[PDB]
Amino acid sequence: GSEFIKIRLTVLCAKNLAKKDFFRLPDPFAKIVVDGSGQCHSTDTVKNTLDPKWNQHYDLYVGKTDSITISVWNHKKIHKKQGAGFLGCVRLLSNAISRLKDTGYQRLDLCKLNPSDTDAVRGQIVVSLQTR
Ligand SMILES: [Cl-]
């Protein structure tokens, strides 16, 4: 009937994120995008931590070829130039969504936007995808 599947994404926490500013811990939040529909969500910001615990879930409507991209950002850098405060991402293509769904919480290593990028990215994000 609909050409989509409802997947509940829980963004549980991240751990061991990069500390880019020596004297100043980030205030991390995650941003979630379903690439084909453009569906966009953000978690709350957690103050002054490399190990933010968000425990927030989102009902994503994912189409047959859509992916889910989750990126982590230091909100203290919100006014700085575009792309500052980047702390890593993960991209789940439709095959990975198919594999991971209903397998429980997964520790996913955060990646640079591209393998060859300079950005210091460290640590993991912990998420689950469930079919609803
Ligand atoms: Cl940062």
Curated annotation (Swiss-Prot):
Disulfide bonds: none
The C2 domain, residue ranges: 5-112
Processing and modification events after translation: Auto-ubiquitinated in presence of NDFIP1.
Protein name: E3 ubiquitin-protein ligase SMURF1
Organism this protein belongs to: Homo sapiens (Human)
Tissue expression per record: Expressed in melanocytes.
Superkingdom: Eukaryota
Classification lineage: Eukaryota, Metazoa, Chordata, Craniata, Vertebrata
UniProt free text on domains: The C2 domain mediates membrane localization and substrate selection.
Function text: E3 ubiquitin-protein ligase that acts as a negative regulator of BMP signaling pathway. Mediates ubiquitination and degradation of SMAD1 and SMAD5, 2 receptor-regulated SMADs specific for the BMP pathway. Promotes ubiquitination and subsequent proteasomal degradation of TRAF family members and RHOA. Promotes ubiquitination and subsequent proteasomal degradation of MAVS. Acts as an antagonist of TGF-beta signaling by ubiquitinating TGFBR1 and targeting it for degradation. Plays a role in dendrite formation by melanocytes.
Protein localization: Cytoplasm; Cell membrane
Subunit architecture: Interacts with TRAF4. Interacts (via HECT domain) with FBXL15 (via LRR repeats). Interacts with SMAD7 and TGFBR1; SMAD7 recruits SMURF1 to TGFBR1 and regulates TGF-beta receptor degradation. Interacts with MAVS; the interaction is mediated by NDFIP1.
Effect of residue 77 to A: Fails to ubiquitinate RHOA
